[PDB]
Design a binder for this molecule. Structure first.
Ligand SMILES: Nc1ncnc2c1ncn2[C@@H]1O[C@H](COP(=O)(O)OP(=O)(O)OP(=O)(O)O)[C@@H](O)[C@H]1O
Ligand SMILES: Nc1ncnc2c1ncn2[C@@H]1O[C@H](COP(=O)(O)OP(=O)(O)O)[C@@H](O)[C@H]1O
Ligand SMILES: Nc1ncnc2c1ncn2[C@@H]1O[C@H](COP(=O)(O)OP(=O)(O)O)[C@@H](O)[C@H]1O
Ligand SMILES: [Mg+2]
Ligand SMILES: [Mg+2]
Lengths: 98, 242, 48, 1545
């Protein structure tokens, strides 16, 4: 959860480097049009076993069902992780939060 | 604006104030009429009641005048001033305004009032108004200032004030600290101050604790130990509830 | 239309509305359904 | 007998015809050929313009008439000709570019496309090579369509090239910020000089123009705009591949600069001062001097503090200031330039002085001490490539040519700025200088790019530009190694930002780790290590307005800076000294004070600005003078002092209200006592201006002159200018007059007018189609291109006469910036010269961010400056003046106090600027024959605007003022002049004879009783309606007032004309009007552009039912009104596809509810002051007895006219007495406030009386008669009211009310208890009892049935329904009966629809299903699919409407809560109910097949004019709608209130 002045991207940058290498880590900032591609990124990196990070989810609140739906679907590989950035937004879906 | 310029300010205030009072009154008369009698809410009075129960007076009013967030606290202030003002005016028509002690709590645009003396002094002194500079002094009355003021009900937080010095506040002490009235006015640049340059420390004079905006800032007796006051975050708030 | 017994009589058998599609309602048909989240959602329209 | 003149004009016009011919010139190709082609186009077209405007000039003279027929020829032919002509040069110029291009890129399948065109072009071209003359070109056949098809082909080949153009932007990156339109010119015509010069600057920062070798093979040199000539060390090789030589120019320019520098520096390092002022460009001098500074210093500190070095510099400076006067002698020097290049260098020195001066106080220990590292340092590396360093950050220098553009004065703030920025660049981060408005932060970056020498692009972030569209722009920047500042990055779509942050992050990571290649949009882009990214944004301020909050993620990628406070007094003096003004330090201090003090002690107007931008200008304001004054006379003391103030009073005096104006002037005296005053001096213009007012027949008033004059130099001063005041202030006229006066001496004025709010955001600004990723213009974007092509000695003005929103306007920031530039989001950008001015006209700047306010100049008008007695005079001249004598005398004395009283009162129906009110008063007064009449007409004019009770106060006092109190004792309102008798006034009731069911046949044209009110509304209209006297106006009255009823009558009075209606709502928009208008109105072409004309009508009229409803943007302006605003003002509008279309003949009219209720939004003064208006109120209960008394008689006399109790015309009037009595009591006790839907109006009285037709009151038998007739009345009543009412207690309350009146007025319990009985369609005499598709006019008749009788009858229906649908164990009980009885009545009635609100499971749906089935009503409910869409729905609706409207079968359209997958549905229904139509539901072509059948039917039925309305009518009769909704549903209550029509209908 971000607060004003909070940026974890740098810590993660470092952890990506530290606990992994190889540029397996890939990332996406939410915005216009990204959502369709994010699915692919997710799908691909999940399948690969690489680390994927997604930012500013609070902006795109309507998405989330589609996302969480796909999350219950998607098949992990050991060493695959999902990293998520969110300002405080209500109406943010409880399912994924769970 | 009348021939004498200070007064011009106060008559202005008189008017603009009353204008607000009556805007408020109308936004009050409206909502006063739906509850007891026959009216249909417009989006206006629909927006009025939203203000009350959000506990924040309306952007409608706060656009006109930056007042306290609490709507009642707003009114009490608005009103108390309105009347005081009529008293100021009275003392002013008679050219008698200087002579009393005036708290700046009352004014909506107190800064502007201050800057209004700046004219009247230069009128008396026949000087380019850019030439003057402003100060106050607790250690007596300003000699070189053609006109002055006695300002009371100033108030302070974070440091304590005794004549000629400031001190540290102890735990017990209420955050709020009453301050002794000033003598204020306008005086030549490159003329001798009331205080030497280095002893006094400038402090803001905020409209409230929120302290969004400032009326002015005043130089005040350091008594050495400059940083501690700053870290103390000492500041002056002109008035509360007025 | 499915949740209501919104069935129309076509001779002996009963046909049912789904989108544009009209289907014979097989009388042995029963339905049940689930969700991971309490709400959302239902309208009072749907509660009944 | 002056027909002679016009005859003579025509003759020579005719002589011109044959005389017209061409300039044909040969040309060779890429595929070398030769063709004749046109030159001096503009010269030729001007002919057209001039002659055509001449024609229309002629049209206005009377003597025109006699020769009218010939005018039409020429009007037609020319109107058409300009169109043809205009097309052709586009065609030509496009071919010119594309043919070379289609020669080289020869894909034969693409060549087909183009070759066909080449062929097609050359083809008709030769018809003209052959036929040299022009007039022939209209004779050619199908040319219209030829031309138009061609252009479309050119559109399409362009699309093929799209793929290609980007590969050419990859091939060379500066292209990324240039328009395709231009690009292909350059691609195609690489060789062409004028192309080159006219398209070079826009490509390259520095170079206005270039020198050309006589051979035109090479280039020896380049020019700055300023004229500063620069040679090229190595000559330029022009080449066939554009990029191949371009790339070389860049590098040869760089090499030229590169060598040129060291040459210069090496002479300067040696003790001999370089002093090659003539040789070297001021760009290099400053630089070279600045390393001299650097080297000196580091050698300096070691040796000594070296105050001697300082003194050197003071002598250098001192030397230069003296030369400043030696640079005044040359003036406009022959073959000479750059004397102001001197002024440039001065400030470097002086910055240096104050730099060193501070260091000398520090007495710095070492060369590499920190306070020096602070300072901005230059070095010529041993590699001979310059480098510049601050602290531990250093950067190599790009050597981009900047040429001479003022650099901003260094200041403490800039230290911070620069350093934080350089540090950010060290961090590989962007830098975010933020602050308030007029800070200077945008310009800073720009100048730091200059000092560092990179090429800097400016951007304006608006319009939520596509992430993709940003992407490319980045892609462009990166390759160029340019510096991209965005001005107002803030104002951007939050979803964009976040995605873009990802773009940024990846790029930074490349710069930091020095990756050669960067990946973005799936593209690998070789990225320049020398790139820079910055953003200059105001905070998301309380004041600032519409700008989107930034994600924290994104923030981190920048290093912020606080630019909030900028030292001015420093900057102030500096500039004066750069001018060489001597008392700099003294005066600078004064100005700053004057500002700060003005700001301190003057009324804090919204519109005032004492920000920096204002100040910056005053300084040029003097530099202009000082530049003039030395030439005219030789220099002296008192002047210099004296001069600044003039330069100041320019910016100043506009804004000031008289009070403030005086207060300011007095202030200046104090700080500048000796100076006194010097007024505006210039009369040359005022003369021309004075002339125009006389020629326009406007009265000459001094202030107008002042403000216009004032306005003039204000325009010279700054790019953008504003005019503020209420409507009728005169502000629009003001500027219009100016151009005319000006134009007489002043070569040109080009006028383009956006009402920005009227049209959508994109229409104005222009946009990127998301799919094609193709640009499509906006109006002003287009207009910009029109003005840039325009010649150097022309004035161009863009007017925005509309309300202001930071979201749209702030998009001109780069344009009105110190920097004059307009930015497309495609990257294309459009600088302007001093040719261009911009103008805004507006009601007020409430919504203005300060940014915009300070961004531009401004003028102010008040009521104080508005002169009324002065304006009335012009009204008097407008009158014939046969009575004008009388009027001057009457009005002079009478008007004023009557006016006053109303202003005192300030109790009135709608906000109108004075003018607005006045005018209403005046427009009613024309033609007034007697004094007696004038009195009435006066009051008429004004009392339109008063809330009713205060009307009386007025009228009354008017007779106190007038001679006599009015003839009417009571209701003196009612007093009407007698035109023939001259008998003053009273009002009369007029009983009509003819009344029967026939008169009441229709839903509309309902026979209307003519009580006094009527004759008042009509009398208060009619002047404004008829012919010559025409005005646009409004009616205000609460719904059910009668407005609709009255107007309908009023229109019918007029013989000339047709009546186009609109039923409005929030969703109502301009295009709805386009089309509703287009249906009944012409589409034609004339001189002065296309126009819409009324078809087969002498006049046309637009009636708009409710103006309030169209939605206001957040800023509070409906675009719909804004449209209408534009229309009245500029008799026209911008067609989509950017055509401007006029409107030749339409009165515009509206109705509306008083603004009381929720969401009936109120309308800007701008519009309201423009038009006339008036108000009416429900007739008094006394009058309502009379309506219905007379509306009642026919229904009773149709049957049983004799029967004892009936007839008895007093007993009839009684009914009216009681219902009206019921009416009141129920409105008193029940209101909107209890429940949204509690809507009661006389409409309901009507619905109640006329509802009685349906009941079989025959009483063929002798009647009770009370209990028969009255239970009916009761039952109807009960059905209209009680059904509607919610609460048990409230129903109980209602019943009381009802019972009371009935008992009191007739017997006691003639109600009794009739709970067992239901009156229903099922069971009526005459055996009505399914077939019967067309409904009775007053609906299916109704008879009286028992409960037990009925219970059978329902099961009869249930049985027979069981055959068609599923059978159901549905039980019966009283409520069910009640439910169904109530529905039957509704569904029998034509247009009758329901709204069934209740809790689920007590089905509206099961009962409704049946009734309709039993009616034989066709019953539709949409099948809902995952593909729920607007497409489904449109189809469905279309289908339903088709049925009820064409087939005429009665149809139930049914909907439940679940069906509304999209909020819009309801607005359609909402519209459908009210109007029987829906906008953008049918397209025009679709109608032809649909309504063809009805064309006869309608004519047989008897209707006149447009069929669609018939369609509509038909719909409304046989189409019934039903809606089931749940009280519990959250938005239930919402929607009801959202869609007013819903509970009204
Ligand atoms: N010099 C003049 N003498 C007499 N009447 C004038 C003069 N100039 C303008 N008028 C009249 O004054 C009225 C108002 O002027 P104007 O139309 O400029 O106001 P405006 O700027 O258009 O306000 P808005 O743009 O809000 O409508 C018009 O009816 C116009 O005909
Ligand atoms: N002078 C009148 N004569 C007859 N009916 C009237 C008169 N005035 C009002 N009414 C009744 O009041 C209603 C006025 O409605 P109308 O004017 O058509 O709509 P609106 O009031 O919304 O513009 C009508 O239904 C009409 O029967
Ligand atoms: N009189 C009745 N006897 C038996 N069942 C009834 C009766 N009225 C309603 N129902 C039940 O409710 C259903 C009809 O509900 P419906 O009219 O669809 O509710 P709604 O219109 O509020 O959505 C019937 O199919 C039946 O199951
Ligand atoms: Mg800027
Ligand atoms: Mg105007």
């Amino acid at each position: 959860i971000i607060s004003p002045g909070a940026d974890p991207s740098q810590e993660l940058q470092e952890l990506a480097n530290a606990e992994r290498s190889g540029e397996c880590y890939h990332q996406v900032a939410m915005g216009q049009g990204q959502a369709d591609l994010a699915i692919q990124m997710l799908k691909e990196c999940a399948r690969n076993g690489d680390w994927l990070c997604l930012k500013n989810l609070h902006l795109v609140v309507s998405w989330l069902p589609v996302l969480e739906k796909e999350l219950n679907t998607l098949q992990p590989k050991d060493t695959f992780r999902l990293w998520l950035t969110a300002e405080v937004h209500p109406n943010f879906t409880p399912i994924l939060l769970q | 604006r009348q021939g004498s310029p200070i007064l011009s300010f106060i008559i202005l205030e008189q008017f603009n104030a009353i204008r607000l009072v009556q805007s408020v009154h109308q936004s009050l008369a409206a909502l006063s009429k739906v509850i007891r009698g026959t009216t249909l809410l417009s989006s206006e009075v629909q927006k009025l009641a939203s203000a009350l129960l959000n506990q924040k007076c309306p952007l409608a009013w706060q656009s006109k005048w930056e007042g306290p967030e609490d709507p009642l606290q707003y009114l009490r202030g608005l009103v108390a001033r309105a009347l005081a003002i009529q008293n100021w005016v009275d003392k002013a028509e008679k050219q008698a305004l200087l002579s009393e002690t005036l708290d700046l709590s009352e004014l909506f645009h107190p800064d502007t009032f201050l800057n209004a003396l700046r004219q009247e002094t230069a009128r008396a002194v026949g000087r380019s108004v850019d030439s003057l500079k402003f100060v106050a002094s607790w250690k007596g009355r300003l000699q070189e200032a053609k006109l002055q003021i006695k300002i009371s009900g100033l108030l302070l937080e974070g440091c304590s004030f005794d004549g000629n010095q400031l001190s540290e506040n102890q735990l017990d002490s209420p955050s709020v600290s009453s301050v002794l009235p000033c003598f204020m006015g306008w005086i030549p640049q490159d003329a001798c101050g009331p205080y030497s340059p280095d002893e006094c420390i400038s402090l803001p004079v905020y409209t409230s604790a929120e302290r969004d905006r400032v009326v002015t800032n005043i130089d005040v007796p350091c008594g050495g130990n400059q940083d501690q006051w700053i870290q103390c975050g000492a500041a002056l708030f002109l008035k509360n509830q007025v | 239309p499915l949740l209501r017994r919104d069935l129309v009589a076509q001779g002996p058998r009963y046909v049912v509305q789904i989108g544009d599609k009209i289907i014979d309602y097989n009388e042995e048909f029963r339905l049940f359904l689930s969700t991971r989240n309490p709400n959302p959602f239902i309208p009072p329209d749907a509660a009944s | 007998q002056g027909e002679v003149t016009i005859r003579e004009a025509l003759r020579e016009l005719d002589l011109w015809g044959v005389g017209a011919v061409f300039t044909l010139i040969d040309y060779e190709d890429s595929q070398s050929r030769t063709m004749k082609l046109i030159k001096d186009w503009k010269d030729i077209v001007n002919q057209v313009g001039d002659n055509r405007c001449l024609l229309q000039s002629l049209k206005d003279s009377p003597y025109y008439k006699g020769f009218e027929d010939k005018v039409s020829i020429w009007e037609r032919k020319l109107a058409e000709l300009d169109e043809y002509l205009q097309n052709l040069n586009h065609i030509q110029r496009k071919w010119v570019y594309l043919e070379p291009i289609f020669g080289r890129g020869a894909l034969p399948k693409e060549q087909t496309r183009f070759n066909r065109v080449d062929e097609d072009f050359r083809s008709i071209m030769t018809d003209i090579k052959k036929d040299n003359r022009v007039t022939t070109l209209t004779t050619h056949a199908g040319i219209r369509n030829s031309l138009l098809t061609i252009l479309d082909q050119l559109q399409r080949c362009q699309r093929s090239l799209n793929e290609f153009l980007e590969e050419k932007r990859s091939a060379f990156p500066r292209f990324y910020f240039i328009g395709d339109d231009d690009l292909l010119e350059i691609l195609g015509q690489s060789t062409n000089p004028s192309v080159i010069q006219s398209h070079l600057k826009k490509l390259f920062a520095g170079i206005n123009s270039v020198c050309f070798d006589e051979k035109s093979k090479h280039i020896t040199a380049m020019k700055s705009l300023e004229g500063e000539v620069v040679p090229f060390k190595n000559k330029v090789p022009l080449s066939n591949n554009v990029e191949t030589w371009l790339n070389d120019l860049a590098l040869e320019m760089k090499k030229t600069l590169e060598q040129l520098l060291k040459e210069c520096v090496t002479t300067g390092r040696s003790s001999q001062g370089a002093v090659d002022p003539s040789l070297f460009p001021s760009q290099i001098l400053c630089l070279a001097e600045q390393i001299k500074f650097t080297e000196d210093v580091e050698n300096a500190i070691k040796d000594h503090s070296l105050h001697q070095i300082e003194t050197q510099l003071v002598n250098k400076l001192e030397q230069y200031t003296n030369i400043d006067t030696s640079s005044e002698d040359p003036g406009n020097t022959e073959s000479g330039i750059l004397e102001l290049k001197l002024k440039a260098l001065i400030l470097d020195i002086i910055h240096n002085i104050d730099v060193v001066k501070q260091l000398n106080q520090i007495q710095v220990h070492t060369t590499e001490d920190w306070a020096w590292k602070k300072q901005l340092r230059f070095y010529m590396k041993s590699d001979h490539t310059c480098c510049v360093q601050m602290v531990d950050s250093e950067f190599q220098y790009t050597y981009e040519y900047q040429g001479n553009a003022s650099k901003l004065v260094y200041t403490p703030l800039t230290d911070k700025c620069y350093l934080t920025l350089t540090q950010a660049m060290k961090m590989g981060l962007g830098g975010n200088p933020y602050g308030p408005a007029g800070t200077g932060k945008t310009e800073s970056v720009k100048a730091l790019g200059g000092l560092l020498g990179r090429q800097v692009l400016v951007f304006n972030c608006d319009e939520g530009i596509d992430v993709k569209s940003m992407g490319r722009i980045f892609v462009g920047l990166v390759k160029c190694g340019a510096w991209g500042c965005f001005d107002e990055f803030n104002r951007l779509e939050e979803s964009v930002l976040s995605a873009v942050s990802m773009q940024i992050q990846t790029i930074q990571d490349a710069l930091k780790n020095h990756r050669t290649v960067c990946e973005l949009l799936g593209k690998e882009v070789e990225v320049n290590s020398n790139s820079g990214i910055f953003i200059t944004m105001n905070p998301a301020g309380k004041g600032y307005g519409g700008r989107q909050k930034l994600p924290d993620n994104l923030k981190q990628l920048f290093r912020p800076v606080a630019m909030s406070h900028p030292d001015n007094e420093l900057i102030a003096e500096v500039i004066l000294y750069s001018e060489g003004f001597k008392d700099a330090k003294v005066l600078s201090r004064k100005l700053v004070a004057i500002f700060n003090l003005s700001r301190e002690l003057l009324t804090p107007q919204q519109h005032y600005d004492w920000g920096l931008r204002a100040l910056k200008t005053v300084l040029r304001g003097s530099g202009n003078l000082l530049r003039q004054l030395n030439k005219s006379g030789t220099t002296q003391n008192a002047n210099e002092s004296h001069i600044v103030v003039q330069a100041l009073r320019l910016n100043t005096m506009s804004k000031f209200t008289f009070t403030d104006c005086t207060r300011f002037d007095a202030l200046i005296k104090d700080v500048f006592p000796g100076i006194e005053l010097k007024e505006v001096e210039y009369d040359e213009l005022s003369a021309a201006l004075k002339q125009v007012f006389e020629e326009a027949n406007y009265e000459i008033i001094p202030n107008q002159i002042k403000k216009a004059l004032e306005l003039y130099e204000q325009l010279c001063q700054r790019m953008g200018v504003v005019i503020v005041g209420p409507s009728g202030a005169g502000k629009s006229t003001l500027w219009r007059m100016l151009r005319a006066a000006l134009c007489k001496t002043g070569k040109v004025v080009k006028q383009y007018t956006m009402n920005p709010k009227a049209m959508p955001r994109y229409q104005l600004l222009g946009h990127i189609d998301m799919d094609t990723r193709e640009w499509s213009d906006g109006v002003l974007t287009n207009s910009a291109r029109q003005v840039v092509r325009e010649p150097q000695d022309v004035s161009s003005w863009i007017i925005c006469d509309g309300d202001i929103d930071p979201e749209w306007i702030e998009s001109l920031n780069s344009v009105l910036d110190d920097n004059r530039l307009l930015t497309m989001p495609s990257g294309e950008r459009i600088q302007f010269g001093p040719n261009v001015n911009f103008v805004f006209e507006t009601h007020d700047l409430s919504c203005a961010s300060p940014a915009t306010i300070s961004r531009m100049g401004m003028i102010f008008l008040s009521d104080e400056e508005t002169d009324l007695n002065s304006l009335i005079k012009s009204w008097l001249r407008n009158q014939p003046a046969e009575y004008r004598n009388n009027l001057e005398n009457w009005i002079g004395d009478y008007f004023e106090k009557a006016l006053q009283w109303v202003l005192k009162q300030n109790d009135y129906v709608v906000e109108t600027s004075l003018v607005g009110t006045v005018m209403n008063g005046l427009s009613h007064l024309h033609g007034c024959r007697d004094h007696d009449e004038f009195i009435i007409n006066l009051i008429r004019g004004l009392g339109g605007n008063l809330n009713m009770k205060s009307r009386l106060e007025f009228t009354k006092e008017v007779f106190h003022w007038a001679r006599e109190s009015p003839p009417d004792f009571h209701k003196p309102m009612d007093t009407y002049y007698d035109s023939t008798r001259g008998r003053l006034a009273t009002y009369v009731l007029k009983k009509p004879e003819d009344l029967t069911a026939d008169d009441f046949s229709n839903g509309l044209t309902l026979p209307v009783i003519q009580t006094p009110d009527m004759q008042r509304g009509l009398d208060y209209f009619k002047p404004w309606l008829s012919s010559d006297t025409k005005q646009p106006f409004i009616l205000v009255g609460p719904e059910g007032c009668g407005k609709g009823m009255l107007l309908r009558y009023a229109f019918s009075q007029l013989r000339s004309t047709q009546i186009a209606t609109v039923h409005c709502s929030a969703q109502t928009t301009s295009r709805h009007l386009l089309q509703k208008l287009s249906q009944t109105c012409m589409v034609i072409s004339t001189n002065t552009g296309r126009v819409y004309r009324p078809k087969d009508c002498e006049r046309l009229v637009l009636y708009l039912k409710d103006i309030n409803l169209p939605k206001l943007d957040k800023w509070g302006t409906s675009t719909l009104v804004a449209f209408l605003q534009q229309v009245l003002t500029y008799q026209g509008f911008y067609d989509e596809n950017l055509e401007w279309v006029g409107l030749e003949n339409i009165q515009i009219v509206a109705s509306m509810s008083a603004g009381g209720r929720l969401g009936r939004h109120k309308l800007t003064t701008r519009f309201t002051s423009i038009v006339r208006l008036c108000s009416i109120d429900y007739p008094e209960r006394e009058q309502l007895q009379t309506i219905y008394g007379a509306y009642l008689e026919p229904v009773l006399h149709k049957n049983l006219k004799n029967h004892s109790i009936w007839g008895s015309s007093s007993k009839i009037y009684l009914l009216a007495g009681s219902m009206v009595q019921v009416y009141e009591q129920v409105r008193a006790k029940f209101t909107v406030d209890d429940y949204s839907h509690y809507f009661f109006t006389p409409c309901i009285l009507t619905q109640w009386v006329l509802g009685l037709f349906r009941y079989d009151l025959e009483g063929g038998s002798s009647n009770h008669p009370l209990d028969y007739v009255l239970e009916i009345v009761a039952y109807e009543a009960r059905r209209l009211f009680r059904d509607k009412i919610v609460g048990a207690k409230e129903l109980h309350l209602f019943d009381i009310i009802l019972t009371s009146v009935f008992q009191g007025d007739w017997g006691s319990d003639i109600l009794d208890n009739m709970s067992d009985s239901f009156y229903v369609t099922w069971g009526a005499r005459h055996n009505s009892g399914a077939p019967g598709q067309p409904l009775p006019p007053h609906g299916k008749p109704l008879g009286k049935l028992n409960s037990t009788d009925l219970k059978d009858v329902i099961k009869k229906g249930l049985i027979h329904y069981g055959r068609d649908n599923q059978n159901l164990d549905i039980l019966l009980f009283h409520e069910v009966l009640e439910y169904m009885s109530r529905i039957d009545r509704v569904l029998s009635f034509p247009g009758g629809s329901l709204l069934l609100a209740g809790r689920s499971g007590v089905g509206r749906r099961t009962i409704t299903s049946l009734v309709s089935h039993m009616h034989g009503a066709v019953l539709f409910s949409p099948k809902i699919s995952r593909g729920y869409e607007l497409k489904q729905f449109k189809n469905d609706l279309k289908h339903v409407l088709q049925l009820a409207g064409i087939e005429a079968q009665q149809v139930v359209l049914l909907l439940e809560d679940y069906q509304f997958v999209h909020p819009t549905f309801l607005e359609m229904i909402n519209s459908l109910l009210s109007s029987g139509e829906v906008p953008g539901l049918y397209t025009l072509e679709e109608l032809e097949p649909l309504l063809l059948p009805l064309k006869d039917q309608a004519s047989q039925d008897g209707f006149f004019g447009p069929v669609f309305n018939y369609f509509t009518y038909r719909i409304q009769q046989n189409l019934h709608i039903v809606l089931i909704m749940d009280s519990a549903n959250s938005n239930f209550m919402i929607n009801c209130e959202s869609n007013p029509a819903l509970h009204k209908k």
